[PDB]
């Protein structure tokens, strides 16, 4: 069956691990344990196709193998949004391509201390020709949509 190699990237503390664990294990990780590098694998049916998701959860604290990249910032962390650009460039680097499957994810959308407005992230994603999706690893809002949207982007390339 098809295997989709997904890589989750973004600054430290934005919720990459919480998002992946909510998707794969269906619970919210409340504590903050910085990641070095972890992998998750799960067989799922996406749009009627049985497939294997292979998800690499990377370190944000200061790749070339992935088929699509989930680029995460937190909507209450303006710096993590400004850091997105640096990840967009590293991805071009490690893939040696200018047209990589990516999805921009604004996480922690359950929080009210918002400093990145939806329209600003929509504009960033627009400029790279990719979707913008907001998520909450805490409430599960948008979580499946973000990862499945990345699979649907990979299928387009
Ligand atoms: N309210 C809220 N908190 C969240 C959300 N996602 C993650 N968090 C919290 O933010 C903290 C950091 O989450 P974590 O997933 O470890 O971040 P990370 O991006 O994997 N960090 P690292 O790059 O160091 O591995 C944790 O306390 C976690 O509970 C979310 O959607 N909402
Ligand atoms: Ca594959
Ligand atoms: Ca918990
Ligand atoms: Mg982590
Ligand atoms: Mg502002
Ligand atoms: Na390269």
Curated annotation (Swiss-Prot):
A motif (Effector region) lies at residues 32-40. One of its GO terms (biological process) is positive regulation of miRNA metabolic process. Changing residue 13 to R: In SFM; somatic mutation; shows constitutive activation of the MAPK and PI3K-AKT signaling pathways. PROSITE patterns: RAS. Alternates between an inactive form bound to GDP and an active form bound to GTP. Activated by a guanine nucleotide-exchange factor (GEF) and inactivated by a GTPase-activating protein (GAP). Palmitoylated by the ZDHHC9-GOLGA7 complex. A continuous cycle of de- and re-palmitoylation regulates rapid exchange between plasma membrane and Golgi. S-nitrosylated; critical for redox regulation. Important for stimulating guanine nucleotide exchange. No structural perturbation on nitrosylation. Glycans are attached at residue 35. The modification N-acetylmethionine is found at residue 1. GO terms for molecular function: G protein activity; GDP binding; GTP binding; GTPase activity; phospholipase C activator activity; protein-membrane adaptor activity. Widely expressed. Changing residue 59 to T: Loss of GTPase activity and creation of an autophosphorylation site. It is an enzyme of class 3 (hydrolase). Changing residue 61 to I: Moderately increased transformation of cultured cell lines. Changing residue 110 to N: Loss of GTP-binding activity. Pfam families: Ras (PF00071). Changing residue 109 to S: Abolishes S-nitrosylation. No stimulation of guanine nucleotide exchange. GTP binds at residues 13-18, 29-35, 59-60, 107-110, 136-138. It is a lipid-anchor. It catalyses: GTP + H2O = GDP + phosphate + H(+). The modification S-nitrosocysteine is found at residue 109. The modification N-acetylthreonine is found at residue 2. Changing residue 29 to A: No effect on interaction with PLCE1. Involved in the activation of Ras protein signal transduction. Ras proteins bind GDP/GTP and possess intrinsic GTPase activity. NCBIfam families: small_GTP. In its GTP-bound form interacts with PLCE1. Interacts with TBC1D10C. Interacts with RGL3. Interacts with HSPD1. Found in a complex with at least BRAF, HRAS, MAP2K1, MAPK3 and RGS14. Interacts (active GTP-bound form) with RGS14 (via RBD 1 domain). Forms a signaling complex with RASGRP1 and DGKZ. Interacts with RASSF5. Interacts with PDE6D. Interacts with IKZF3. Interacts with RACK1. Interacts with PIK3CG; the interaction is required for membrane recruitment and beta-gamma G protein dimer-dependent activation of the PI3K gamma complex PIK3CG:PIK3R6. Interacts with RAPGEF2. This is GTPase HRas. It comes from Homo sapiens (Human).
